[PDB]
Amino acid sequence: RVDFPRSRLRFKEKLGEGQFGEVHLCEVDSPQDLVHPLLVAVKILRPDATKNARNDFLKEVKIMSRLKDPNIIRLLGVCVQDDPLCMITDYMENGDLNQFLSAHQLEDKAAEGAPGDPTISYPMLLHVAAQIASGMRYLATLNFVHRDLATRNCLVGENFTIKIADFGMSRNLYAGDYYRVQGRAVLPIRWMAWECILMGKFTTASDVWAFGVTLWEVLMLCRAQPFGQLTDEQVIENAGEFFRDQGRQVYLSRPPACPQGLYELMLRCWSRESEQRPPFSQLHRFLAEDA
Numbered sequence: 001r002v003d004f005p006r007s008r009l010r011f012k013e014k015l016g017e018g019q020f021g022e023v024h025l026c027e028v029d030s031p032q033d034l035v036h037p038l039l040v041a042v043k044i045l046r047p048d049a050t051k052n053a054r055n056d057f058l059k060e061v062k063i064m065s066r067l068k069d070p071n072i073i074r075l076l077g078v079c080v081q082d083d084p085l086c087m088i089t090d091y092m093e094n095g096d097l098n099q100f101l102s103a104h105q106l107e108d109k110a111a112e113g114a115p116g117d118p119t120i121s122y123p124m125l126l127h128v129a130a131q132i133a134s135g136m137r138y139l140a141t142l143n144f145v146h147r148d149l150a151t152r153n154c155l156v157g158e159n160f161t162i163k164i165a166d167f168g169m170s171r172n173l174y175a176g177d178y179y180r181v182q183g184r185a186v187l188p189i190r191w192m193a194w195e196c197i198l199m200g201k202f203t204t205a206s207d208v209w210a211f212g213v214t215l216w217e218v219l220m221l222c223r224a225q226p227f228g229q230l231t232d233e234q235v236i237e238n239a240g241e242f243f244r245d246q247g248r249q250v251y252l253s254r255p256p257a258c259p260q261g262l263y264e265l266m267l268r269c270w271s272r273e274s275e276q277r278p279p280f281s282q283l284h285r286f287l288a289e290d291a
């Protein structure tokens, strides 16, 4: 099945960089002809990319080809017949959600405002969170497990639209969010269900746990790291307390912006029993309909 026409991509700005690739903002004139212009993001494999990096790139494209939802990153096209390998996706103009919320302050306003405005309202936070829940609801229907849900992996577009993505665990900006040990998978422990930390297997139910923490982030306006006053080792030992179930495990505290009713739903996402955690359809309905 034919590549996207590589010649159509007019490169404008370099958005980001990794040791293997770089991401660019491109515009596409006359998107009408493709069966004023469209902005897209493209990830391109750098010419010095190892054999292993190329393989990972091709697998990433295949994985991404599964996912077709308004609130998940979308694979618009590819250029892989020739080099450099190219992956084309939605451009989300307001960047990653963690940096976005970090730059905002909470205000009680009836004005929807703009993503550029210095403040954001509580109803809008609920709307951000609902969109993530809706994305995750879709992934759950495919039994697709994300494994790294967090605000650093979400993107914000015009009019506060949200898309879930996955940028890997290697960005220096978020190094503090990962627990690294020689010979082991890198783990986002502060977002991980206890059974994930102890046994290393991920499920939709552990994605629900991570969503609870992602919700906590959003309601904190990303002002502080989950369990930020505790060390990595204490976070890992906390998973042990969940397993022993002697009532000594600890939870994230209620954000100021978070009403008690919503907090109680958040706490359910952190149920010891995976089966007692809310399904994403119920999480989505609560945020979309129940404030």
Ligand SMILES: Nc1ncc(Oc2cccc(CCNC(=O)c3cccc(OC(F)(F)F)c3)c2)cn1
Residues within 6 Å of the ligand: 015, 023, 041, 042, 043, 060, 063, 064, 067, 072, 073, 087, 089, 090, 091, 092, 093, 094, 095, 139, 146, 155, 164, 165, 166, 167
């Ligand atoms: N400004 C701006 N605008 C848009 C932008 O986005 C991208 C730009 C270039 C490349 C990508 C794709 C990265 N790969 C994934 O996201 C990925 C991979 C595997 C599974 C996966 O599952 C999931 F969708 F469920 F998460 C997701 C996104 C970034 N910056």
